Every structure is written in structure tokens, then in C-alpha cells.
Amino acid sequence: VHRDTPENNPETPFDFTPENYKRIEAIVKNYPEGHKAAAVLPVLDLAQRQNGWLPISAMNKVAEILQVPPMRVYEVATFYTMYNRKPVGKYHIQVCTTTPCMLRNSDSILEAIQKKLGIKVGETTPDKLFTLIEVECLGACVNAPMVQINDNYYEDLTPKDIEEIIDELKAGKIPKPGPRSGRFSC
Amino acid sequence: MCNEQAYSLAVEKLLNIRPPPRAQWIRVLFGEITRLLNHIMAVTTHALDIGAMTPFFWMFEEREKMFEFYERVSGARMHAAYVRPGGVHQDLPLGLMDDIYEFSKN
Amino acid sequence: XXXXXXXXXXXXXXXXXXXXXXXXXXXXXXXXXXXXXXXXXXXXXXXXXXXXXXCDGGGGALGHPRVYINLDKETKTGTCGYCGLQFRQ
Amino acid sequence: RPTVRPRNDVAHKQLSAFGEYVAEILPKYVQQVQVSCFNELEICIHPDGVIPVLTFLRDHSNAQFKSLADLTAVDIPTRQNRFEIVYNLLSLRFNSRIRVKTY
Amino acid sequence: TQPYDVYDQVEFDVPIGSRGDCYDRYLCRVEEMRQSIRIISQCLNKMPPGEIKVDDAKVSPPKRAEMKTSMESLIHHFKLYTEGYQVPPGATYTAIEAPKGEFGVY
Amino acid sequence: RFRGEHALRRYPSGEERCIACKLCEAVCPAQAITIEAEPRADGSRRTTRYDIDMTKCIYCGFCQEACPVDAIVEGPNFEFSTETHEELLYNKEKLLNNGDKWEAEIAANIQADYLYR
Amino acid sequence: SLKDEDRIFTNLYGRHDWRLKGAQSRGDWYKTKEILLKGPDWILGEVKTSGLRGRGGAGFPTGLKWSFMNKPSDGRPKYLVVNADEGEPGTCKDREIIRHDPHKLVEGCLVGGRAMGARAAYIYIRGEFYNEASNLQVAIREAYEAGLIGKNACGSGYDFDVFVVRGAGAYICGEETALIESIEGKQGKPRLKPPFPADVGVFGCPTTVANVETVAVSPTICRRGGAWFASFGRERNSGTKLFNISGHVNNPCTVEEEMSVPLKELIEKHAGGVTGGWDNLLAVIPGGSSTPLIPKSVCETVLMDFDALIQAQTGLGTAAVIVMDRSTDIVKAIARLIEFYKHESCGQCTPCREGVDWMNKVMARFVRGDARPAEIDSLWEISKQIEGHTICALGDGAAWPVQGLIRHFRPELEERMQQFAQQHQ
Amino acid sequence: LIEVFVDGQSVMVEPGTTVLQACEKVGMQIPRFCYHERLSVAGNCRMCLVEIEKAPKVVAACAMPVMKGWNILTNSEKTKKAREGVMEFLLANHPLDCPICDQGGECDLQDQSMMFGSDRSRFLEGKRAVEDKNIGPLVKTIMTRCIQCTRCIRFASEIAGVDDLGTTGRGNDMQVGTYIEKMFMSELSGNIIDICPVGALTXXXXXXXXXXXXXXXXXXXXXXXXXXXXXXXXXXXXXXXXXXXXXXXXXXXXXX
Numbered sequence A: 001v002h003r004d005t006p007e008n009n010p011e012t013p014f015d016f017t018p019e020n021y022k023r024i025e026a027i028v029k030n031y032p033e034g035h036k037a038a039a040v041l042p043v044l045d046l047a048q049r050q051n052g053w054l055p056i057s058a059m060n061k062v063a064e065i066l067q068v069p070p071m072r073v074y075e076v077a078t079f080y081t082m083y084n085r086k087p088v089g090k091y092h093i094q095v096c097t098t099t100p101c102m103l104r105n106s107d108s109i110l111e112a113i114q115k116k117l118g119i120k121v122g123e124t125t126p127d128k129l130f131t132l133i134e135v136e137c138l139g140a141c142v143n144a145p146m147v148q149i150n151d152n153y154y155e156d157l158t159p160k161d162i163e164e165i166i167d168e169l170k171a172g173k174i175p176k177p178g179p180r181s182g183r184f185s186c
Numbered sequence B: 001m002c003n004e005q006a007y008s009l010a011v012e013k014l015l016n017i018r019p020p021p022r023a024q025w026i027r028v029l030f031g032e033i034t035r036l037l038n039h040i041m042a043v044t045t046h047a048l049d050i051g052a053m054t055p056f057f058w059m060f061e062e063r064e065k066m067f068e069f070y071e072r073v074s075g076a077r078m079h080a081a082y083v084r085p086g087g088v089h090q091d092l093p094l095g096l097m098d099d100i101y102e103f104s105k106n
Numbered sequence C: 001x002x003x004x005x006x007x008x009x010x011x012x013x014x015x016x017x018x019x020x021x022x023x024x025x026x027x028x029x030x031x032x033x034x035x036x037x038x039x040x041x042x043x044x045x046x047x048x049x050x051x052x053x054x055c056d057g058g059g060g061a062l063g064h065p066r067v068y069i070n071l072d073k074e075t076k077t078g079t080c081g082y083c084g085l086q087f088r089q
Numbered sequence D: 001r002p003t004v005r006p007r008n009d010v011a012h013k014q015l016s017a018f019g020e021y022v023a024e025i026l027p028k029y030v031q032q033v034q035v036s037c038f039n040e041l042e043i044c045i046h047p048d049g050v051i052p053v054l055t056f057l058r059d060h061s062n063a064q065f066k067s068l069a070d071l072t073a074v075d076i077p078t079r080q081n082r083f084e085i086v087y088n089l090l091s092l093r094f095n096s097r098i099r100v101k102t103y
Numbered sequence E: 001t002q003p004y005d006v007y008d009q010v011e012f013d014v015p016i017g018s019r020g021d022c023y024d025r026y027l028c029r030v031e032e033m034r035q036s037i038r039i040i041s042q043c044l045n046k047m048p049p050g051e052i053k054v055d056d057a058k059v060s061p062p063k064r065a066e067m068k069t070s071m072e073s074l075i076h077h078f079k080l081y082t083e084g085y086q087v088p089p090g091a092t093y094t095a096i097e098a099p100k101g102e103f104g105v106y
Numbered sequence F: 001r002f003r004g005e006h007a008l009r010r011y012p013s014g015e016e017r018c019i020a021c022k023l024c025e026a027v028c029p030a031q032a033i034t035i036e037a038e039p040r041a042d043g044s045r046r047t048t049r050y051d052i053d054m055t056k057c058i059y060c061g062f063c064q065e066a067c068p069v070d071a072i073v074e075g076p077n078f079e080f081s082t083e084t085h086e087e088l089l090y091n092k093e094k095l096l097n098n099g100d101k102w103e104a105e106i107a108a109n110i111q112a113d114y115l116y117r
Numbered sequence G: 001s002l003k004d005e006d007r008i009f010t011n012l013y014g015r016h017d018w019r020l021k022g023a024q025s026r027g028d029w030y031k032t033k034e035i036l037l038k039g040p041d042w043i044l045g046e047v048k049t050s051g052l053r054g055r056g057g058a059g060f061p062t063g064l065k066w067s068f069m070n071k072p073s074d075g076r077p078k079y080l081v082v083n084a085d086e087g088e089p090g091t092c093k094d095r096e097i098i099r100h101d102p103h104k105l106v107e108g109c110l111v112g113g114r115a116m117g118a119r120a121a122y123i124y125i126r127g128e129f130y131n132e133a134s135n136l137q138v139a140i141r142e143a144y145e146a147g148l149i150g151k152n153a154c155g156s157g158y159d160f161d162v163f164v165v166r167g168a169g170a171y172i173c174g175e176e177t178a179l180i181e182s183i184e185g186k187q188g189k190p191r192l193k194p195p196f197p198a199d200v201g202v203f204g205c206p207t208t209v210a211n212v213e214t215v216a217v218s219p220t221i222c223r224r225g226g227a228w229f230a231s232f233g234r235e236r237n238s239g240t241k242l243f244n245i246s247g248h249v250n251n252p253c254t255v256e257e258e259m260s261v262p263l264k265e266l267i268e269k270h271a272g273g274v275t276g277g278w279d280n281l282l283a284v285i286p287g288g289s290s291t292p293l294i295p296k297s298v299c300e301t302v303l304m305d306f307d308a309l310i311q312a313q314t315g316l317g318t319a320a321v322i323v324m325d326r327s328t329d330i331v332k333a334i335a336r337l338i339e340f341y342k343h344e345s346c347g348q349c350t351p352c353r354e355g356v357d358w359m360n361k362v363m364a365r366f367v368r369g370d371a372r373p374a375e376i377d378s379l380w381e382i383s384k385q386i387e388g389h390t391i392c393a394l395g396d397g398a399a400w401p402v403q404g405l406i407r408h409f410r411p412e413l414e415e416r417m418q419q420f421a422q423q424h425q
Numbered sequence H: 001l002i003e004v005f006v007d008g009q010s011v012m013v014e015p016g017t018t019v020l021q022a023c024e025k026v027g028m029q030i031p032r033f034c035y036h037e038r039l040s041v042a043g044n045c046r047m048c049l050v051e052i053e054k055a056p057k058v059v060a061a062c063a064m065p066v067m068k069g070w071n072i073l074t075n076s077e078k079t080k081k082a083r084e085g086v087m088e089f090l091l092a093n094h095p096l097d098c099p100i101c102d103q104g105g106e107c108d109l110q111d112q113s114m115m116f117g118s119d120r121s122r123f124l125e126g127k128r129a130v131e132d133k134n135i136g137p138l139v140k141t142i143m144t145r146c147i148q149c150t151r152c153i154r155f156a157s158e159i160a161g162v163d164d165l166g167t168t169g170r171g172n173d174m175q176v177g178t179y180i181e182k183m184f185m186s187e188l189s190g191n192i193i194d195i196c197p198v199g200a201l202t203x204x205x206x207x208x209x210x211x212x213x214x215x216x217x218x219x220x221x222x223x224x225x226x227x228x229x230x231x232x233x234x235x236x237x238x239x240x241x242x243x244x245x246x247x248x249x250x251x252x253x254x255x256x
């Protein structure tokens, strides 16, 4: 589902940021002064970072602050793939399955992550620690295995190294830009 | 089948589109089968007009067997929209080609 | 359902206190059995697994052109154009 | 083309010679407009003289039509002049079809 | 002289009398009937297996199994009625030999 | 494949097979078939007026062929004789729906219709 | 005539130590005051005389495109925007030019500011690469506070302000018109390209489309001599393009190399899987995703330059190697490429929303082998049609690689269909 | 003023004029989906793709202006290759409703297939279906029948005022609906059912009542509300049921 929006218990009750309200006003100043609807694309990402799982009522409150059409602002976040719509846990990890990564085994890393963290490849974990979702290209293709979680993307991870990093992530953060090899040249 | 033949060909000359090679051979097979109906009436009713009683019933048993070929090829007895600007409307069923040859032999 | 006059079929009124209808008196008026779409909801709804499923009356033999119906609304019944057959999940 | 085209034009060049032959006589009394399309020829004739046109095509040595078998008329209210009598002619010795019209 | 749908290839026999009397005008029709089976028999022997209607769905309606699955076929089936064929403008005259005479459709 | 008196078909699990198009109305050279449609309670939208006049109708099989859902399927009927014109012409379905007595033959005949002959 | 690889010459190579102060010592804004003092007509001529080629996946001249705007007289003030995100997979344009060395990209906007006539500079980075985008914001904050670019900095009258904005990460950074629409605030969909380019009207102003690898090359072309970049490469193609090699290889690495380099020597620098073109079956593409796969027989004659690669099948747009092994399936790999374009398609032109999705659904059957042998040739007819009748060139990106299955191959696809027909059917 | 030849014949046109707008002066209509009367010019279909005298790629009639004196052919071989092809893309993911569909003859996409579309065959396997969108009194909207264009999207924002319809997805799963469950306001949004070319939006009062055939049209002025004049009312035997807006130069701007 992408077009359909729920009406029960997630349609009227939502909160807007108050501590980051001063930072939200500064974001509009970065673009053009008159005819500023450019901040709506940036504020959608900022609201998702502060409050997890963006609601339909939260999008309506964001459109009133920037002063724009309610139908246009709701549709703007629908086209983008970066913003989450349903629900995500503390740290949501996305795996790359695209052809440059698939050539040097990407499915082997995906199968190892699916069994160690349990549950299906599409459905998220009931414990709400790691959310599994099939994604396209992330960015850095230099490392053959690539996975992006929360903010920092881990590059070059083996079949046994990926499961060990996932279990360690439950208590302590584990950035691993290059576990396999140097980032510049390998 | 001698009728609509003139009409469909006029539409075929207007649209400049040739009928399929199989449909062309069915059109002659049914174009000659109409001559078996017309030239019989050109004799039977003509002789009935003069005073001859026999030849009218000599060939109308044959003619009623002839309408079975029309009925098997299209749902109507006499007049059928079988001949169309798209060549021929419907295919010949498997129980006709064995019947036409058996009928022509006798 | 019938009131005073002959039974209604596929929503059709006979006559208000008998004024227009008079010919259908000596001869008995026709009636179709199960014409109020009572047999339409009598058939049980089929369960589905896919997001969209193609409908057919009885393959290519019986008259039914292929129509795809989406079963994702949950609250909606989900029925094809030709049939009253409902699909869930 | 296998099923696209009905027939190829080959006699059309020879039929176009007929459209020039009658036009070479050049009467304002008879000729006016000559149209030829799809293996056929169409001529329209001035109302004042139709009988001298009908004596032509008949008997003539180069074009021996003679048989003036079919005779039609068009009903149309678009033009200032309403009806249009259309003659359909056929030759038995020459084997060709030509059309005569009134305006 | 003027072929319609695969002619000259089929051997035709034309009965022509001497006097313009009713007896000779009767004999030619009976001689047409005796020399009609030859056309039917040649039509039975020469049959190419293939298509019944033209492949163009703009002129001839598609098959029943064809329209139920594919999209384009059903729309052309829908549009071949109400406002059907769409004919190219221009006056045309065709005549195919009837057993009585000619059908001069204009 | 033979055409006689008109009768409209139905699906194996109830329901009217006719969808109401005005398609068969346009093909009809006699214009014997009349059709007017209103929504059936809720959801389905299938017919209200459906008269096929036997005062006209040349029996083409056109409406049998033009119908996408195969509602009008022509049965091998012969017996039809009336006192008046009113008894002859078919009413709003009903008598046409009473083609159930011929629908058993229709189901056998249509088995020769799909993948034609 | 033959070109040698690099040989101690690079536009941007620093990755070991660079931040702000460390970068300045190692060639950064060396002639910043010299370039600012020079006129806009002479600075635009500096790029045109050298003959710089477009680093982004388009195949357009960089000198011609930058001078296309020119700005003789304008009511609304002009602004130039540079794309930092990577569209096509198998490209290290965002991981190296934005993450490793942000000082080169930040100086590039200031270098093409006074010459192009831009009031403000904008950057659009990838949504997934948040850590990489944060490094660009940190370098911009260090430059503005100290006094490198803005208001009256670097000894120039014309003001230029740099701002970084996060993108969606799909087709938003794809097309030239798409970058203007994404920065404006509207949904990620490219504008109509035929009547007006970026120069005529883009986000209420005259604009110019720039790539991350193209904008970073502009200070390198201005500070160093024009003949230094013109010498390396071919007759038509000039400069140096960074090529990223990843896939079936002993060690995958992205490294800068000179133009018109042979494929046999470029793959040898990173060392491929088992053998380059002797034992392992070659199926490597010259581009990222825009270019179709190259055959094993024709690989030595093909060059990295855009002029030479156009003769053999299709020219490399992204210009990056994606090596494939003999053990890896060819049909399964290209099916994923079209599957990428199924999700990246914006949803405007009808032969792309219901075209690419139609192509991918048929291509899924080819892996199984249920498809007819006649269906291969019919697939080629539809795929060619999308290339011509689309507003943006992302539809072309789902058209070129599919043509690379019909070309060169064909018995490989037929063998998969024939095997399933005899075993299952 | 600058003259440019269209199908060899030269016609006078303004300096800023569309290719489809200029072709109408020479009495030639190209296949259209995105309007030229009052709605804003937009791509998002590429049906009106026409080839110039010297061009490597075909250009859209809505987007590309004439500008310079260049020849453009309407009945060209290159133009026919596009029109016969783009139709196949439109019908690859089309739900098939033609008999059940509320429109039948009035549908613009239905007519274009008969005149320009490829008749011989259609290759397709599995068409995607969209969920039904919420609508109040007028125009019962079916999202499946919609071709996903930009006509009603711009109509809500410009002509109607308050925006409601827009883009929802990215690929074939993208819907033209409101996304949030909310009923559309009246004002002038009743004309949106008459605006859409396909049988996607059609009035609930006139749904499954009468087809385009058999109904006879007659022009009459509107009685309810002043200024509004000229509206076609279908007779369809005895009692009228379908009402449609008739085109007017100054009286009404293609909306009742």
C-alpha cells in the first residue's frame, strides 16, 4: 500500500516539534525568500528524524507552518522514498539487492540477516529493534556488500560479520564504514 | 451467398483490403451452391407455371437437403449474414466437407 | 413480496389501486424465479492470497472477459463487474 | 502487403488514357470534370446536352460500350444543385466499365 | 473476364445457345447445372488451411477467445458496432454475375 | 448452432449474465431489442427494461455474436404461436428469463461455439 | 597516440588527510584571488578553449552547456545548482567527490559563480548518504565563517552563497529538469525538456545543470594550464574521468584514470576475477546502468573515451566498470537492472510507468524459462520505442541495456527457455 | 508574426504558439490527452509525438513550439509508428470495462484506438488494479479505469480553486486519488466528470443509465443560476437523464 491512508488511531493524534521550532524557521531562510515551498521537502525529513513514523495529522500540521496546500504537501512525501510512512523501530536497516552488488553475492548477505534477526524479509521485528525492508541502491557501490541503517551506512560485510554486527547493535552503536577494507582503494 | 458477395466486395474495394485466401475459396464454393438453388427454381417453378407437376417435387427434396448445408454453416435456414466485408464470418465445421463431396457424387 | 396484486419481479410495480393494468387479468402474469438477486449473495465469498486476482465465470468457454480486482481496502467487499462474487485477503 | 492491399494497379495507366481521349475532344458542352480512381472512370456532363453524350461511347470504334445497363440517381442537399443522375455503362466487346453523371 | 475472389484458376463452362427462344434459354440453365459440379469439386480439392476473417480488427471482428484476454481486440469489437467500419469516401460500382443477371451495387 | 426464439442466459451461481450496454441495441437492424438500465439496489448495475419484439427481428445471430458476456444465446426453438401481438412480443425479461427450459440445450450448444467448430 | 594512466597527475586525489586547513596546503584555492579579479568573459573562455567533456551521464560538452546560459540581460537573478547524488548504480561520484574531499566541490561553486553569473549556489546530495552530506555542510561552515566565499570574500564584488539540501534519492537528481523541480518543493518529476532548458526558466530563475565530478574539475582547469587537461585523452574527448570498478574482481576499488584508456589495462589495475578475457565469460558494462553489456570478443578495441565508445554498440554515460563472472547468470543480472528502473521511474510519460513495469514483468519469466522463442524478437520492438518517445532519458536507461540482450547474446536466453519447456511443460 | 509550413501547406501563426494549436488552423487534429482549450500545457503521456522534416527524435505537440519556419508532417510514416505504439502502452495496464464502463462512445481513448491504435494484436500479462477512491454525491470515481494523466490534477488547483487530486506513488502503483479520505467540495468541481477523457470519473446520477448511442442531443440554456447558458441535454426517449456542458466562446468556459 502506498496510496491508501489509515483512519483509525493514527489520523488526528500527532505532535509537532517545539524544541526544534527555532531550527525549523531557519530552514526556510536557506531557500528563496518569496514563494517558498522548498522548505516542505526539507521539513518532512526533519520531522521524521525527531518523531518516528510520520502520521497524516503530522503532515497537515507541517503544511500549515510553511503555508502551503494540504493536498500538495501530502503528495510530496508520497513520491519520495527516503521518508517512512508506516512504522519503523529504533534503527531500521535497508539492504541493497541491485545488480552491481548482486554480482559479488548480495543475496547471501540478505539471507544471513533474515535468519539472525528472524522474521520475514518484508515484515519488521516484533521487538522493534531492527526493521527489515528491501531497498535499491544506497550510494557507495565500491564495497560489494552494502547496508544503510539509521544515519551511517556500513560497507563491506561478510556472511558471518553481518550477523555479529547486528547483534552487537542492540546495546552499543557499531559504525562500520569499512570493516572489509580501506574506503579509498582496496 | 451470391447476395452479400456483391455488397462485401464493394466494401472490400472501398477499404482496399483483400479477404484471406481460405475465405476466397469458401466464397466460390458457396457462390456455386447458390446456382444450385437459383437454376432449380428457374426450372421447377417455371415448369409448375406451365403445368408440370413432377419436376417441382423431384428437386425440392434435394433442395431441403441443400438448406442443411446452409443451416450447418450458419444458424439461419435461408438468409444468413455469413458473407461479410471481412471475407467470411465463421469457419466450415468438420461435418460439412464430408457431406458436400457425398452430395455432389449423387 | 406481494401486496394485493401480482408479485413484483426485479423491482416493478403493478398498479396503484388497479387503474392502468387490466389486460393481465384473464391471462396469468409472468414471474421469474429468484429475480431479486437472492442467489447473488447465496454464493460464498472466495479467499485470496495475492493483491489482485483475475476473475472468470468458467474459463474461456463461458462468457466472461478478464477483469482484475484489487483486494486491499479491507472494509470494501471487492467484486468484479460481471459477477457478484466477493474476494477477501 | 499480403492482406493489406486488395489489388495492385497495372491497368490504371491504360484506363487513364480514356480520361484523356474524351478530354482531347474538349467540349464545354460535354466534358467539364474527369475523375478516375480504383480501376474505374467517372465523367460528369453539362445538363444542356446529354443525348449527344449517350450516342457517344455507343457505336464508336475505339470505345464500343453500347450497353447502358444500370441507371442511378443521387439525393444530396449540400450543393446549390440538389439531385444527380448517374449512368452506369458496360461494354461486352471491349470489356470495361465507365460512368456518366449530371450536375 | 472479370475475376472476383480467385477466378480463372477454376475451370468454368459457359452454355451459349443459337436461337433466342424459350427452349434454348431453358437448356443453357440445365447445362449450367450439369457444368456446376466441376467448380464445386475443384473448390473441394483446392483448400488452403488458414484464416477465416481478415487480421485487421478495424474491419473484421476478432475471435471470442481473443477478445476476452487482450485489450485492443475488445475495444475494436466494441467500436465495430454503434459507429462501425468507417468507410473511405468515394463512389464505387461493383457487379458479380448472379444466376439471374447482375447485382449492380452502387 | 441454430437461431430461433430469444432467451437470455445466467451464471452457474445465480446472477443475470446481461450487463446492460445498449450494444446489441445498436447492432440490431430491425431495432427490435430495447434496453434501459438502472442500478440494482447497491453495487451491481444490470437492467430494468428489456423487451425483444417478435413483430420485428429478422434473426441474424448478430446480438448473439455482439454480446461480450454471451447473454443472448440462440436456442433451437420452433414452437411459438399466439392469439394477439401483445402475447407475441416479449416483456421485460421474465419470459426471456423463462428460457431456463431451453438453457440446458444452450449449455450443450455453446460447447460447440467456444473455439468455433 | 596511446595514453598512459595518470602518472602523478590528478584533479582530486586526496583522501588520507583533508578537512579545511589541511586541504588548503595540498592544492585548494591557490589562485582564488586571481580567478575572482579576472573578467567573466575570460573565465568562461578558459573552459571553452580547453574543451572539457561532461562528467555526468549525458554525453554533452561541458564548455558548451556552461556558456549556453551566458546571461546578457535578466530581470530575475540567476542561480546555479550542482547535483551531488548518484543516480545510476555502480558509481562512486558521491562517495569520493563529496565525502572524501569536500573542499574541492565547495571551491568549484565559487569558481563557476562570477563567470556564469550566479547569485547563490545550491547542492543536492543523496538521501541515504546522510553522513557523506554532513561533511559538505561542515566544509561550507568553515569557509563562510573564515571568509572564503560570500558577500565580499576572495576579493570579488559578486556574492555567492553555498547551501546543501537533502534529496529523495531516486529520479530527483536524475534529469536536468528534475533537479530544478526537486529543489523547488514540488513532487519528484522532471519538467518538459523540448521548449525550455535550465537556462530559459528553472525554479523561477535562469539556471545551469552541473555534476559533482564536473563542478569539481572547474577549479582544476582554471588554476592549472588549459593544455594540461587537453593533452590527456583523445581528439574529441579530453580530460580525466573517475571510473569505479566493482563486482567480479579480486579487489574492487575506485581510482582516477586518464581518458581513452583500454579496457584490458583498466581492469588489470584492480585485478579481475580469475581472468579478464581468457577464461571467465565477459559481460561487463562500460557504463553504470545507462550502457548495455559489452561482448568478450569486442573489448580490447573499445576505449573509455566517449567518442570511441559510441561506435561500438553504445557510449558509456557514467563510465564505470561492472565486471561479471562466468559462474554468475547473465539473464538474472540484467533483470535486476530493469527492476531498479521499475522503482526509480517517476510516473509521468505513459510508455514508462506502464512501459518499464510491463518490461520487468515479462523479464521475470525469462529467468524461469516459460517464455516462447518468438517473444524475444517482439520484446526488441517495444524496447526501442521507449528510447524515442519520452520526456526524460531515464526511459532510455531502461531501453539501452535490454537491447544488449538481443545484441551479442541470444543463444544464452534461448537455452533457458528450451530447458524449462522440456522439463516442466 | 512568422509563417511555418504544416504538411507542406503554409499557415500564419503567432511567435509563441503550440504545434497542436497551429495545426488546427490548417484543419488537422492530432491525437490529444492533455487539453489545449483552457487547461495548462503539460507532457505526461507523449501521445501527440510528431516528427519534423529534419529531426533525430520526435517532439511532443503540447511542449515544443514552432519558433522557426520548419516543416512538420501529420500523415508521416514516423508519426504513425509512434501513435500505433503509444496506444499499446496505455492499454497494457487497462482494467477492461468497456461494456460495464459508464462511458461508451463518449470515451476519447476508445475512439483513438479505432483511428490511430494498432488493431491486429495486443500483448499483455497481468494488469494492476487500484483501490476505489472516496467520493460524495457527484462523480463516482473508479481509480482502475484511470490512465494516470495530469488533466484533473491541474483542474482542481487552477479552475476549481482548492486542490485535492495528485500523485500518490512512483511506478504503475501510482494513483490519481486524494490519498487522504476526504470528500471533494462542490463549487465548480462537478465539471471534472465531463473533463476526464476515460471512464474514470462519471456522474452518479447518470451512471449506467444511457450510452453515447441512441441518446439524441439538443442545445438549451440553463434555467438554474443566471449567466450560465448553452448546455446539451440528451433526450434518450421521452425522459431526459444526461446533461452535458456545451462549448461557448464567452458565455461559459467549457464548464456547466
Ligand SMILES: Cc1cc2nc3c(=O)[nH]c(=O)nc-3n(C[C@H](O)[C@H](O)[C@H](O)COP(=O)(O)O)c2cc1C
Binding pocket: G053, G054, G055, G056, G057, G058, G060, G061, G062, G065, G083, G084, G085, G086, G087, G088, G173, G174, G175, G176, G209, G210, G211, G212, G214, G290, G393, G394, G397
Ligand atoms: C537516468 C539518469 C540518471 C542521472 N543521474 C544523475 C545524477 O545522479 N547526478 C548527476 O550529476 N547527473 C546525472 N545524470 C546526468 C544528467 O543529465 C546531468 O544533469 C547533466 O546533463 C550531465 O552533464 P554535466 O556533467 O555537464 O552537468 C543522469 C542522467 C540519466 C539519464
Ligand code: SF4
Binding pocket: F017, F018, F019, F020, F021, F022, F023, F024, F025, F035, F066, F067, F068, F069, F070, F071, F072, H099
Ligand atoms: S445482451 Fe449482451 S450486449 Fe446486450 S445489453 Fe446485455 S450484456 Fe450488453
Ligand code: SF4
Binding pocket: F024, F027, F028, F029, F030, F031, F032, F033, F052, F056, F057, F058, F059, F060, F061, F062, F063, F064
Ligand atoms: S437476431 Fe438480429 S434482428 Fe433479432 S434481436 Fe438479434 S440483432 Fe435484432
Ligand code: SF4
Binding pocket: G171, G189, G190, G344, G345, G346, G347, G348, G349, G350, G352, G353, G390, G391, G392, G393, G394, G395
Ligand atoms: S521517462 Fe519515465 S522517469 Fe522520465 S519523466 Fe517520463 S515517466 Fe518520469
Ligand code: SF4
Binding pocket: E075, H094, H096, H097, H098, H099, H101, H102, H103, H104, H105, H107, H108, H109, H110, H145, H198, H199, H200
Ligand atoms: S475507459 Fe474507455 S476504453 Fe477503457 S473500458 Fe472505459 S469506455 Fe472502454
Ligand code: SF4
Binding pocket: H146, H147, H148, H149, H150, H151, H152, H153, H176, H195, H196, H197, H198, H200, H201
Ligand atoms: S481521472 Fe481522468 S483526468 Fe484524472 S488523471 Fe485519471 S485519466 Fe487523467
Ligand code: FES
Binding pocket: A096, A097, A098, A099, A100, A101, A136, A137, A138, A139, A140, A141, A146, G089, G090, G091
Ligand atoms: S548498487 Fe548496491 S550500493 Fe549501489
Ligand code: FES
Binding pocket: H031, H032, H033, H034, H035, H042, H043, H044, H045, H046, H047, H048, H060, H061, H062, H063
Ligand atoms: S496530448 Fe500532448 S502531452 Fe499528452
Ligand SMILES: [Zn+2]
Binding pocket: C055, C056, C057, C064, C080, C081, C082, C083, C085
Ligand atoms: Zn467475474
